[PDB]
Structure 1
């Protein structure tokens, strides 16, 4: 015992004082380790698993079973020692030192006869004192492991087993895999109920059953880069830390778990506040602050986001999938930009992908990256990485007609199952994103024409996968007057940064609207009208030092009766 303490740690003596966390629901895997360790030759189990499924927890549960006395006679009163290979390597300047340390360890194990040995991260065994082709830990342990005189429990990740252990087929032979699978949601709830006491004692808080049910459910549903039960325990522990910080008896409920998840991932899973609820009920109006008209599209996007925020969304599908199809200039991109402005506060959070660049068959690898063995494999996809940066986002596909069918057929899996796989092998979840596809095609008759054109240019699968197909209608005179008002307001807002104010009378706005209406409008025309007749003349006057900073400018009209065409009318900048 005087040798193994320097290079290892006694797990059974750790369970003597209860320093190991209780292990719940691992009866099958612990029993599997028991019944592998009871063999005659090659009695070495390896716990192969994923990161964070409890592989070391299985060994700690075995130590707790040993100290309790549930074990059979072959594992009764057997001290379980975890071996620190870094402690063996450290301080060995001379080959005699390292190999003599390892053989002293083996001699003590064989002499006492009641030490089971535990190697966490077994992939450190392939090369410890030297390379794989010389004397190292693996080359000394292999003869003992093969004839079954040494009881060694390895612990290894699935990827580390594939990469490091499986290349050395000699150590793969001497270890039987014991798969410690990912526990389910109910198993995670039971595990969390097991660990109430320790976290309550450390955090000085109180955790409810609904809090742990919510933690397990939300960790299973939303976080998509970790494995249960580690993420649920992370949420519980971070909520407890939040309460302990905030007080200086606490109570941790599902709201604190939801807030921790919102901080972690950016997905707004919350109990809705009163202000945010009144915002969401009226958010058609907050959209209509920017987007003018198009009541059907605004209403559909409003229903989708309202369904998402109230917890009535299908967990296997995205928040919404939209086809904004219609003539150019109506506001197909503007509704998406206004939605991004509503959801995030800024318009740069809108993950915009232009489909004009995807006009040839080779560019489909841009979205999900290059396959293994090719250039650009390490960087990965452009869309998958952007969505993995923030799970909650608005993903826009601009001018969808320009792309070819391969991108659609790649994104069908996104539209239905809410998943995308990159060439790296990872899976990114699109289940929390709002997918919008803008189209300028087919231009009550407009509805039929657009629907027929979208039927012609698309396969039925893509149109079935889409939640809402919205045909944007043409602009009218009243809403184009409101448009003119909005452009003048934004120009004035730009102008106040230079210590100047701008105003128009009703006549000038009416003249702009009369010079800016046709069935092709928007801001593709009538922003040129502002650019030609208002912005440019103002620039000419300010550069000439006339009507300079400090004076409010009032734009009037001359040679106009207010009803006629106004071709002879002149804008005057007083």
Structure 2
């Protein structure tokens, strides 16, 4: 009773149903099958139907609504719906009654129209295909500039990707826009949640006539945004001309995506908020409606408490879609992604994209991150030259995709990083002396973190460098940053005490915590994610800084503005202290008294620094002499410093209270200054020799000079 062609179309659609593993074969599956069927295809072509725009829509509906049965043991195979059988019987009854031999696809197509409540019938009516057109086919023949504006125009073609679900939110927006006062919807939600999607989706509903009667003549023009808009062009005169052009007496809605840029954040010149607040009630011969978009926090403080327009807008909470609602969203977009990637995603991969992104991609939200994993996974197939189809198993693909987004970044094996880290303790020991323990405890902690051992939610290392003044605490961290090849961010905590400096001259506390949070600390760590953060004199810092520090050491993040701006994941935090000296006896309790157990227990290590021995002080002196020798040897000048003069430099360049802090000046005043004259207009111009000695019963340095081409004669 049925054609060979139609019987094939049925079998091929039955085939797709036990591969996608559908429990139901529906009327929508039937129309989908009919797109392959020559008679139904020619009928639809006759009415000027874009087969693809119908293809994508049927496919999207089918995947969102058909139950999936890959579970276990219990009896399930594809079962046609009562409705599906009803359409075929309607087609056979009509054909037999018409005097025709067999049922063709075009006859089944006529039978679908009679399923009054079906989606298949609904789509045929949307594509403007009437039942009469198929009957007659069978019988006879045996304003703004340039950005992403005018969403109504983008909807009539195919620029806007479809909006799935969210009826309550659109309904609420339409109702808000329909009010007499406070007519302006304000979509509030996290990034990726689907705010732009709702605005764009509204423009489609206006075109489709699914927003009737008084909102038919509406057009949604989208403005340009995305935190302060004034570069060049004078914002005040272009906007005034725009709002007036939007007003000739029309029902024009203006979508301002990321509305916190113009208003709330505080601009430089006028116009901005001041001009947008103007047209909201009645300050002309007309009125405009605005759809805004912002995040939870930027609505909370900068919009509602600071107040720029808050009351005139109606807030609509746009929540993150749940797992199953996101599965429906992905299922509704899946066919267009599959067409583009030439690949098929299994229902298990779809659920996995959603569920794995929820668990592991915490920095992002719902639809957005799940859609990016799905797009990324399909693109990934191309890299295997062809694009390997994907049978019934894709979870593993999704797992690699999610793993790459969620984590990974680190090179650390058999060479470059290996040699540096294996010699880090030796490289530092050749610049900082008498503190082998400190260096060893520090490098042990770096290597450990570099081996992938440690936490991902915490800094590379959090250390408390404790010890006396001038023993190598600052020098070690400066060198640590030079040996690791990373930036050095330095902050003095004595400049971050809240109100201690006044009677002198300096005084600036509206910042401090505001200096660190608002800008400085956050800005520096965003600019240089891989760095060593040195905080001098940590004991002098205000408790607000300590809470901020307690968060860094726990969360690995710090928040000034959202999207989790400051990332301390790749930072070596170093805090130096002069607190409990290793006029105080120290063996235990001293450092413990000054810093709370809560702050101390978040440290990776309290790295202790000892006093400098007599031998160490001499090594420091030699280091200064060798640096000078390096400079002098290049100019053909040889510097020799005697033992007695080395003892004299050691004596003068080391205070027990100040450490080796006075050494640089002592070396400068006694070894560098006395050679300037001779190197410029004396015996050392063409090279030579300097001998520095000591005159004992005088305790002052002796300076001998000798010159020559090289060392010719004496």
Q: How does 1:38-117 map to 2 (within 5 A)?
A: 47-58=187-198, 83-84=220-221, 99-100=247-248, 102=250
The residue that corresponds to 1:292 in the other structure is 433
Instruction: Classify 1:119/1:96 alpha carbon distance in 2 versus 1 (closer, same or farther; 3 Å).
Output: closer
**C-alpha displacement at 1:197, in angstroms?**
6.9
The residue that corresponds to 2:573 in the other structure is 435
- Give the Cα–Cα distance (whole angstroms) in 2 for the partners of residues 137 and 92 of structure 1: 14
1:181 and 2:320 aligned: yes
1:276 and 2:276 aligned: no
- Give the Cα–Cα distance (whole angstroms) in 2 for the partners of residues 439 and 456 of structure 1: 13
Does structure 2 retain, via aligned residues, the 8 Å contact 1:199–1:237? Answer: no
Instruction: Classify 1:432/1:357 alpha carbon distance in 2 versus 1 (closer, same or farther; 3 Å).
Output: same
The residue that corresponds to 1:9 in the other structure is 152
The residue that corresponds to 1:304 in the other structure is 445
- Deviations 1:422-468 (Å, cap 9, x if unpaired)? 6999964444422212122444x899706422123233222222221
- Deviations 1:473-522 (Å, cap 9, x if unpaired)? 122355444323321232234447xx6244445x7267515751678385
Three-state SS of the structure 2 residue aligned to 1:516 is: helix
Three-state SS of the structure 2 residue aligned to 1:321 is: strand
Give the RMSD, CA atoms, in angstroms.
6.1
Does structure 2 retain, via aligned residues, the 8 Å contact 1:92–1:98? Answer: no
- Give the Cα–Cα distance (whole angstroms) in 2 for the partners of residues 422 and 60 of structure 1: 31
The residue that corresponds to 2:524 in the other structure is 386
1:512 and 2:655 aligned: no
1:491 and 2:628 aligned: yes
- Give the Cα–Cα distance (whole angstroms) in 1 for the partners of residues 619 and 316 of structure 2: 70
**C-alpha displacement at 1:402, in angstroms?**
4.6
- Give the Cα–Cα distance (whole angstroms) in 2 for the partners of residues 122 and 440 of structure 1: 48
The residue that corresponds to 2:493 in the other structure is 355
Q: How does 1:465-484 map to 2 (within 5 A)?
A: 465-484=602-621
Under a length normalisation based on structure 1, what TM-score does the superposition of the two structures give? Answer: 0.62
Three-state SS of the structure 1 residue aligned to 2:691 is: strand
Q: How does 1:133-282 map to 2 (within 5 A)?
A: 133-134=281-282, 139=287, 154=291, 156-158=293-295, 159=298, 163=303, 167=309, 169=311, 171-172=313-314, 177-181=316-320, 269-272=409-412, 274-282=415-423
- Deviations 1:104-135 (Å, cap 9, x if unpaired)? x7xxxxxxxxxxx8945496999779633426
1:132 and 2:273 aligned: no
**C-alpha displacement at 1:380, in angstroms?**
3.6
1:456 and 2:593 aligned: yes
Does structure 2 retain, via aligned residues, the 8 Å contact 1:352–1:395? Answer: yes
Higher relative contact order (CA 8 A, sep 6+): 1
The residue that corresponds to 1:369 in the other structure is 514
1:320 and 2:461 aligned: yes
Three-state SS of the structure 2 residue aligned to 1:541 is: helix
Three-state SS of the structure 2 residue aligned to 1:396 is: strand
Three-state SS of the structure 2 residue aligned to 1:523 is: coil
- Deviations 1:151-195 (Å, cap 9, x if unpaired)? xx94521336973999464652xxx714143999xx79x979969
Instruction: Classify 1:297/1:220 alpha carbon distance in 2 versus 1 (closer, same or farther; 3 Å).
Output: farther
- Deviations 1:195-220 (Å, cap 9, x if unpaired)? 9779979xxxxxxx9xx99x979995
Three-state SS of the structure 2 residue aligned to 1:485 is: helix
Does structure 1 retain, via aligned residues, the 8 Å contact 2:223–2:254? Answer: no
- Deviations 1:368-396 (Å, cap 9, x if unpaired)? 317xxxxxx9x944433333432332222
Three-state SS of the structure 2 residue aligned to 1:334 is: helix
**Which entry has the higher C-alpha Rg, 1 or 2?**
2
Three-state SS of the structure 2 residue aligned to 1:553 is: strand
The residue that corresponds to 1:395 in the other structure is 533
- Give the Cα–Cα distance (whole angstroms) in 2 for the partners of residues 341 and 299 of structure 1: 17
- Give the Cα–Cα distance (whole angstroms) in 2 for the partners of residues 236 and 566 of structure 1: 84
Instruction: Classify 1:316/1:52 alpha carbon distance in 2 versus 1 (closer, same or farther; 3 Å).
Output: same
**C-alpha displacement at 1:331, in angstroms?**
0.4
- Give the Cα–Cα distance (whole angstroms) in 2 for the partners of residues 546 and 256 of structure 1: 71
**C-alpha displacement at 1:338, in angstroms?**
0.5
1:331 and 2:331 aligned: no
- Deviations 1:390-429 (Å, cap 9, x if unpaired)? 2332222223345566654554334444454569999644
The residue that corresponds to 1:553 in the other structure is 689
- Give the Cα–Cα distance (whole angstroms) in 1 for the partners of residues 463 and 533 of structure 2: 10
Instruction: Classify 1:55/1:296 alpha carbon distance in 2 versus 1 (closer, same or farther; 3 Å).
Output: same
- Give the Cα–Cα distance (whole angstroms) in 1 for the partners of residues 643 and 245 of structure 2: 91
- Give the Cα–Cα distance (whole angstroms) in 2 for the partners of residues 320 and 167 of structure 1: 45
Three-state SS of the structure 2 residue aligned to 1:350 is: strand
Three-state SS of the structure 1 residue aligned to 2:573 is: strand
Instruction: Classify 1:183/1:427 alpha carbon distance in 2 versus 1 (closer, same or farther; 3 Å).
Output: farther
Instruction: Classify 1:500/1:196 alpha carbon distance in 2 versus 1 (closer, same or farther; 3 Å).
Output: farther
Return 468-477 or 309-318, whichever deviates more: 309-318
**C-alpha displacement at 1:472, in angstroms?**
0.6
**C-alpha displacement at 1:59, in angstroms?**
5.5
Three-state SS of the structure 1 residue aligned to 2:687 is: coil
Does structure 1 retain, via aligned residues, the 8 Å contact 2:538–2:575? Answer: yes
Instruction: Classify 1:191/1:85 alpha carbon distance in 2 versus 1 (closer, same or farther; 3 Å).
Output: closer
- Give the Cα–Cα distance (whole angstroms) in 2 for the partners of residues 309 and 61 of structure 1: 48
- Deviations 1:500-547 (Å, cap 9, x if unpaired)? 244445x7267515751678385335445533442232235335x223
The residue that corresponds to 1:374 in the other structure is none
- Deviations 1:201-242 (Å, cap 9, x if unpaired)? 9xxxxxxx9xx99x9799957x8xx8788799999999x99x
Given candidates 507, 515, 523, the residue that maps to 2:660 is 523
The residue that corresponds to 2:46 in the other structure is none
Does structure 2 retain, via aligned residues, the 8 Å contact 1:258–1:269? Answer: no
Q: How does 1:10-25 map to 2 (within 5 A)?
A: 10-15=153-158, 19-21=159-161
Does structure 1 retain, via aligned residues, the 8 Å contact 2:169–2:316? Answer: no
The residue that corresponds to 1:500 in the other structure is 635
Return 192-201 or 381-390, whichever deviates more: 192-201
Three-state SS of the structure 1 residue aligned to 2:586 is: helix
Does structure 1 retain, via aligned residues, the 8 Å contact 2:206–2:218? Answer: no
Does structure 2 retain, via aligned residues, the 8 Å contact 1:12–1:79? Answer: no
- Give the Cα–Cα distance (whole angstroms) in 2 for the partners of residues 51 and 315 of structure 1: 23
